[PDB]
Amino acid sequence: QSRSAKAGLTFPVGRVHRLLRRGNYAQRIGSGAPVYLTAVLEYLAAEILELAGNAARDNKKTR
DNA sequence: GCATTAATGCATCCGCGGCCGCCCTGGAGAATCCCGGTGCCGAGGCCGCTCAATTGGTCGTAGACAGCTCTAGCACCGCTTAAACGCAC
């Protein structure tokens, strides 16, 4: 099983971590950076999607 | 034949009157909202693939922990001008 499931995170911690590793950012990356990044992206995406869905539903649309 | 004097054709200067345009009220017509109504098409649930996230071990390595060093920020003191404020035209 992946850490995202045991941490209840929808976004992939492993994918973010491997993006950071090959993203020429720092040679040493702690385990907290990928989980923090996944959490913040999940929060931002959730808020944006909720607002967009509100804007869609107030215009008689389901998309 | 010439002046002349009353009859006559207008002379041009007002008197009068035919001559309008603006607000307020009378509804009239175009635009909008909105879902039925049906045709269209793509969002996505399902099927099959595949590759890298996770696991464990190896191993070396950077940073918290003091630990110490020294250093300028600050609170304080008092002089010297020095602009800021209120006013007034």
With a CB cutoff of 8 Å and minimum separation 6, the contacts of A21 are A29
Closest by CA position to A4, among listed A46, A35, A44, A50 = A35
The resolution in Å comes to 3.8
C-alpha to C-alpha distance for A27 and A23, rounded to whole angstroms: 10
Name the residue with tokens 């990356």.
Answer: A29
- In sequence order, the 6+-apart residues with CB closer than 8 A to the CB of A41 are A11, A16
Q: Smallest Cα–C1' distance to nucleotide B35: which residue has it?
A: A60
A56 CA to B78 C1' distance (Å): 72
Q: Among the residues of chain A, which ranges form H helices?
A: 3-6, 13-21, 32-57
- Nearest nucleotide (C1') to the CA of residue A63? B43
Residue with tokens 């992939």: A12
Elucidation method? cryo-EM
Closest C-alpha to A34, from A23, A45, A46: A23
B strand bases under 7 Å from protein CB: 35, 52-55, 62-63
The span from the CA of A27 to the CA of A61, in Å, is 48
- Single-letter code of the amino acid located at A38: T
Tokens at residue A10, please? 């929808």
